[PDB]
Amino acid sequence: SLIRKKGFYKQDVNKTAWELPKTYVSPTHVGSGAYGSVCSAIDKRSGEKVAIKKLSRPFQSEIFAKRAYRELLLLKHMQHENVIGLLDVFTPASSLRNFYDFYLVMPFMQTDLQKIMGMEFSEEKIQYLVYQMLKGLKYIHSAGVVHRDLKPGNLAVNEDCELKILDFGLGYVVTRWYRAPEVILSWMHYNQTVDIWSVGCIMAEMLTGKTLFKGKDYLDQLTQILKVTGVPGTEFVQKLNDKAAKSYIQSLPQTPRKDFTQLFPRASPQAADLLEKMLELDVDKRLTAAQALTHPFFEPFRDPEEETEAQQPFDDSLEHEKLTVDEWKQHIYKEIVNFSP
């Protein structure tokens, strides 16, 4: 029996106890989150900087354990340069009795779009960033995984504006500025283009420095959205499965739509055209990621070779299962043992 597996040391990070393999040195607090915390560290085998997320009591309930397992599997499955992935995964535990937590090792990302937002970007920087976003989205979408909560805080960037999508595939009055109207209002069934709406919202915010859509409640956010999209016509209205929402729309002053040239008076024609095609209420007309990648806005950067798809769909399998915390610990433990970098 052991206290922790050999080649592990104990060190305080941000005033909590961490247990790390010897190969990871110089841990430095990065952030504390809702289900874990993150430090940066150096892999002395190569001197590369990595992020390490310590899961916080993942085995306190079945909900917590399923969540932790899902994050592990989603990170393991995706292999794309614009989608954050798994470099390593470990636990200091030597047994199931000793198994209390585990750690995920990922490439270190300096910051994210939320921290460098607020300000107006050059259209070339917007081109590069949004192109990377759409490549990552095309990949996870091709694996059958949607994000559903894409926002600037979910888009990590390093100093060279290399971008990785975070937190893919996961009440009160939480902010929903970047969520698609069909998600907020559940007035028709959604598809993968829910993320494309978010891209539009983010791109607009880069062009203007101002958040496109806010509002204290869902009705106010809808009013702000219709200011931009215009009140939709009968073709869209017929697709609503919410009869009260349909009646509400048909009873509004029928305000026409766009001149996104007028809405975004400093954007290029290609930027405004792409925004027009992403900020589209009709979920069957809104661009997919793959279609948006073909748009003239990305011509200076476009490389179809980089626009890869996942070779296999994301496949779990236990996603519907209702198991005990002990069984979830068994499966997670197996996955950690079987990992290979």
Query: Annotated active-site positions, please?
Result: 149
Binding part of the chain for ligand N17, among 64-72, 235-243, 257-265, 277-285 by CB under 6 A, reads: 64-72
By beta-carbon proximity to ligand N17, the closer residue of 30 and 267 is: 30
Among 93, 105, 106, 163, binds ligand N17 (CB under 6 A): 106
CA distance 282 to 191: 11
Query: Tokens 């209205």 label which residue?
Result: 237
CA distance 73 to 253: 48
Query: How many C-beta neighbours within 10 Å does residue 14 have?
Result: 14
By beta-carbon proximity to ligand N17, the closer residue of 156 and 228 is: 156
Q: Of residues 109-148, which lie at the interface with ligand N17 (CB under 6 A)? A: 109
By beta-carbon proximity to ligand N17, the closer residue of 168 and 187 is: 168
To the question of whether residue 38 is assigned a binding role by annotation, the answer is yes
CA distance 59 to 325: 6
Contact characters 70-99, ligand N17, x per CB under 6 A: xx--xx--------x---------------
With beta carbons less than 8 A apart as the criterion, state whether 131 and 103 touch: no
CA distance 7 to 318: 33
Minimum CB distance to ligand N17, residue 255 (Å): 39
Among 3, 10, 25, 35, binds ligand N17 (CB under 6 A): 35
For the chain, how long is the longest CA-to-CA vector?
A: 74
With beta carbons less than 8 A apart as the criterion, state whether 73 and 54 touch: no
Minimum CB distance to ligand N17, residue 200 (Å): 22
Name the residue among 324, 3, 19, 50 with its Cα closest to residue 332.
324
Which residues sit at the interface with ligand N17, rule CB under 6 A?
30, 35, 38, 51, 53, 67, 70-71, 74-75, 84, 106, 108-109, 156, 166-170
Annotated binding site for ATP: 30-38, 53
